[PDB]
Symmetry: C2
Subunit: 72 residues, 2 copies
C-alpha cells in the first residue's frame, strides 16, 4: 500500500554496484515528461535495468533543455 | 572490397547528430576484447544504433581497467 509506483524507476537498474563493469550504459534522456529522462545501464552479465543512483547528472542534461530556452 | 568490417562499429550509431536529443544513450562498456567497449545511443525517435564519434572518452573508461592494474 505505498504511493502508486512512479514512471519507470528512481534508483539504479534495481541495485547498486560498480557501474564500471556495465556492458551497456543506457540513458533514458528523452525530452521533458516522465517516461525516459534518467540514467540506465546493463550491468555486465549480471544486472540490466534503468539507472538513477541519486545522480542528478542526467537530470542536468535534460535540464539544459529548459535552461537553453531561458536565454530571453 | 574493403578491409573486413570491424567488430560492431567505429562511428556513431550510423550518422552524426546532436546526441542531446538521444532517447536512450547506450554504451557498450564491456571488458577488454572487441565486442562491446565503445559508446552507443538511441537517437530520439529517428536514429538508434551504436556510438563512437571520434570520442575516446569511452575508451578512457575501458582504459582505466588496464591502468588500474598498472599500480605495481
Amino acid at each position: 500500500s505505498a504511493k502508486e509506483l512512479r514512471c519507470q524507476c528512481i534508483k539504479t537498474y534495481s541495485k547498486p554496484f560498480h557501474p564500471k563493469f556495465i556492458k551497456e550504459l543506457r540513458v533514458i534522456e528523452s525530452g521533458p515528461h516522465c517516461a525516459n529522462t534518467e540514467i540506465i545501464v546493463k550491468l555486465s552479465d549480471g544486472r540490466e535495468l534503468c539507472l538513477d543512483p541519486a545522480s542528478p547528472i542526467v537530470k542536468k542534461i535534460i535540464e539544459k533543455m529548459l535552461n537553453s530556452d531561458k536565454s530571453n
